[PDB]
Amino acid sequence: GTSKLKYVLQDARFFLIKSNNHENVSLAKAKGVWSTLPVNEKKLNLAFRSARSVILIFSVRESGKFQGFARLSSESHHGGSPIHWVLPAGMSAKMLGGVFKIDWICRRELPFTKSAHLTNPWNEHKPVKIGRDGQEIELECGTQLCLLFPPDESIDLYQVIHKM
Ligand SMILES: CNc1nc(Cl)nc2c1ncn2Cc1ccc(C(=O)O)cc1
Numbered sequence: 469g470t471s472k473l474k475y476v477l478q479d480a481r482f483f484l485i486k487s488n489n490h491e492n493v494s495l496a497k498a499k500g501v502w503s504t505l506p507v508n509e510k511k512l513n514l515a516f517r518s519a520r521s522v523i524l525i526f527s528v529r530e531s532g533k534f535q536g537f538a539r540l541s542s543e544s545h546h547g548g549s550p551i552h553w554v555l556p557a558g559m560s561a562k563m564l565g566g567v568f569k570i571d572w573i574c575r576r577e578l579p580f581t582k583s584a585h586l587t588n589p590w591n592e593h594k595p596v597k598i599g600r601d602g603q604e605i606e607l608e609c610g611t612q613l614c615l616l617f618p619p620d621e622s623i624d625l626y627q628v629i630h631k632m
Contacts, residue, residue, distance in 0.1 A: 472625040480521035482610025486601040487528050491554045503564040508602035513543045534578045538570040574620040
């Protein structure tokens with residue numbers, strides 16, 4: 469069902485994550501971690517204290533799809549382990565240094581063609597697929613976007629609800 473999902477999404481904040489490559493999203497799904505650039509890291513750390521749930525919605529650049537969504541379970545932390553990210557051309561390894569722990573809510577894909585009816589007030593009402601890494605998605609648009617994803621029956625939201 470969708471009832472526990474709706475409960476997790478209640479009064480949540482939503483951020484669009486854009487990854488340059490599929491490998492880091494795969495690593496994030498395997499290890500329950502994410503790292504971003506310092507500007508976005510500060511925003512997510514602020515949001516984590518501000519909201520009952522902070523939801524990251526992932527899209528790999530050029531894929532035409534979202535790859536899933538996850539909830540922050542921690543602020544960023546250093547020195548736990550050097551996650552073997554694949555660095556973009558130019559991107560150093562100290563720029564992706566802060567590691568957030570995340571709990572996946574859905575590891576299924578959603579093509580952009582299915583979200584074409586959703587616009588983001590915080591990005592000039594452009595379609596929600598449009599946005600830079602870290603773009604905040606307003607509550608109503610982000611809730612409907614998450615509800616569009618196919619159900620991920622491999623995930624049990626009971627433990628996610630307890631961390632709230
Ligand atoms: C493990 N975390 C990550 N992995 C990958 Cl592959 N891309 C990420 C990412 N977090 C953000 N992005 C996209 C991005 C946006 C701007 C620049 C730049 O201004 O150079 C570089 C990358």
